[PDB]
Design an enzyme around this catalytic site. Structure first.
Site, PDB file in Angstrom:
ATOM      1  N   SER A 154       0.796  -1.259   0.000  1.00  0.00           N
ATOM      2  CA  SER A 154       0.000   0.000   0.000  1.00  0.00           C
ATOM      3  C   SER A 154       0.795   1.258   0.000  1.00  0.00           C
ATOM      4  CB  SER A 154      -0.945   0.063   1.188  1.00  0.00           C
ATOM      5  OG  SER A 154      -1.958  -0.942   1.030  1.00  0.00           O
TER       6      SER A 154
HETATM    7  C1  LIG Z   1      -1.778  -2.252   1.674  1.00  0.00           C
HETATM    8  O1  LIG Z   1      -0.674  -2.575   2.018  1.00  0.00           O
HETATM    9  C2  LIG Z   1      -2.847  -3.280   1.961  1.00  0.00           C
HETATM   10  C3  LIG Z   1      -4.067  -2.700   2.730  1.00  0.00           C
HETATM   11  N1  LIG Z   1      -3.419  -1.643   3.503  1.00  0.00           N
HETATM   12  C4  LIG Z   1      -3.249  -1.826   4.738  1.00  0.00           C
HETATM   13  C5  LIG Z   1      -2.320  -0.974   5.506  1.00  0.00           C
HETATM   14  O2  LIG Z   1      -2.577   0.251   5.524  1.00  0.00           O
HETATM   15  O3  LIG Z   1      -1.306  -1.459   6.098  1.00  0.00           O
HETATM   16  C6  LIG Z   1      -3.974  -2.867   5.133  1.00  0.00           C
HETATM   17  S1  LIG Z   1      -4.142  -3.460   6.707  1.00  0.00           S
HETATM   18  C7  LIG Z   1      -5.697  -3.206   7.522  1.00  0.00           C
HETATM   19  C8  LIG Z   1      -6.703  -4.343   7.279  1.00  0.00           C
HETATM   20  N2  LIG Z   1      -7.981  -3.676   7.070  1.00  0.00           N
HETATM   21  C9  LIG Z   1      -7.883  -2.236   7.241  1.00  0.00           C
HETATM   22  C10 LIG Z   1      -8.781  -1.403   6.355  1.00  0.00           C
HETATM   23  O4  LIG Z   1      -8.673  -1.517   5.141  1.00  0.00           O
HETATM   24  N3  LIG Z   1      -9.655  -0.558   6.950  1.00  0.00           N
HETATM   25  C11 LIG Z   1      -9.801  -0.396   8.398  1.00  0.00           C
HETATM   26  C12 LIG Z   1     -10.563   0.294   6.192  1.00  0.00           C
HETATM   27  C13 LIG Z   1      -6.392  -1.937   7.027  1.00  0.00           C
HETATM   28  C14 LIG Z   1      -4.628  -3.494   3.944  1.00  0.00           C
HETATM   29  C15 LIG Z   1      -4.354  -4.998   4.056  1.00  0.00           C
HETATM   30  C16 LIG Z   1      -2.979  -4.170   0.699  1.00  0.00           C
HETATM   31  C17 LIG Z   1      -4.309  -4.854   0.460  1.00  0.00           C
HETATM   32  O5  LIG Z   1      -2.554  -3.519  -0.492  1.00  0.00           O
END
Ligand SMILES: *C(=O)[C@@H]([C@@H]1NC(C(=O)O)=C(S[C@@H]2CN[C@H](C(=O)N(C)C)C2)[C@@H]1C)[C@@H](C)O
Length: 252
Positions: free
Chosen positions: A58
């Site tokens: 991300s």
């Molecule tokens: C990016 O690395 C991924 C997404 N980004 C993040 C991060 O900011 O580290 C997460 S972790 C976490 C899980 N769910 C949350 C969310 O989306 N909300 C609360 C709205 C963030 C993701 C896994 C990747 C998918 O690119």
């Protein structure tokens, strides 16, 4: 992919200080890098580990946002995108977004929709000019998510600083708009900007990142924490960054 896609070997031609931040890292493994504008100097914990290249996940949303601004895919009057009604497991994803909400809530589909409008040759030209990691676009699909594109902790700092601070072909408007999207914390002492990244492989955390910058009344610092083992989440990289910046006196 090639022999040099997993490591960054270009000598730092700058002043640098080696840090010991191992007690803060604790049971986790990784590295921390910071660059001070006033000093023109780098401060590095785990220098060897800092040059190992990893998927940006991300954190690459920084660059997709800048590219989308630069190509007028989004602007400052309108960066809105409506949701296509596909249910995601996170409610913050299940609605209209702008650049601010999508960056804050790491809403992948927003940035994926941007990436789909950007011709591969433009991206290839950008990554060359930015010196972005291994520059490897692979299949050009979701290439920034546990795929071919990789970048080191040390490069995250160098590339972000150079993108923001040099007079280049990105406009001031775009840089300011990207900045407002990245603002996390502002008080009397500092402004903290940044972006987490997490790579999830088999339900397990594999790769944590927090890449950003701090503006104080005296200096501007660019920084990045990467975690490769222990509990390598974006959340934990952010926490570790905060404690290190605090200890170093950057937040006070
Ligand atoms: C990016 O690395 C991924 C997404 N980004 C993040 C991060 O900011 O580290 C997460 S972790 C976490 C899980 N769910 C949350 C969310 O989306 N909300 C609360 C709205 C963030 C993701 C896994 C990747 C998918 O690119």
């Amino acid at each position: 992919q090639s022999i040099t896609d997993y490591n960054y070997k270009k000598p730092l031609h700058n002043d640098y200080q080696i840090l010991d931040k191992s007690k803060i890292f604790g049971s986790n493994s990784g590295s921390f890098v910071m660059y001070s504008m006033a000093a023109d100097a780098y401060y590095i914990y785990n220098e060897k580990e800092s040059r190992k290249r990893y998927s940006p996940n991300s954190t690459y949303k920084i660059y997709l946002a800048m590219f989308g601004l630069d190509r007028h895919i989004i602007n400052d009057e309108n960066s809105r995108m409506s949701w296509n009604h596909k249910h995601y497991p996170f409610d913050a994803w299940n609605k209209e977004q702008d650049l601010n909400t999508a960056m804050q809530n790491s809403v992948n589909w927003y940035f994926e929709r941007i990436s789909d409008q950007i011709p591969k040759n433009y991206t290839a030209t950008q990554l060359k000019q930015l010196n972005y990691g291994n520059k490897n676009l692979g299949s050009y699909k979701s290439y920034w998510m546990e795929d071919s594109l990789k970048i080191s902790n040390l490069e995250q700092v160098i590339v972000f600083k150079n993108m923001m601070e040099q007079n280049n072909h990105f406009s001031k408007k775009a840089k300011n708009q990207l900045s407002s999207s990245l603002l996390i914390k502002k008080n009397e002492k500092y402004e903290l900007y940044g972006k987490t990244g997490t790579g999830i492989v088999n339900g397990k955390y594999n790769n944590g990142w927090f890449v950003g910058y701090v503006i104080t009344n005296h200096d501007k610092y660019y920084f990045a924490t990467h975690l490769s083992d222990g509990k390598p989440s974006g959340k934990n990289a952010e926490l570790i960054s905060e404690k290190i910046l605090k200890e170093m006196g950057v937040l006070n």
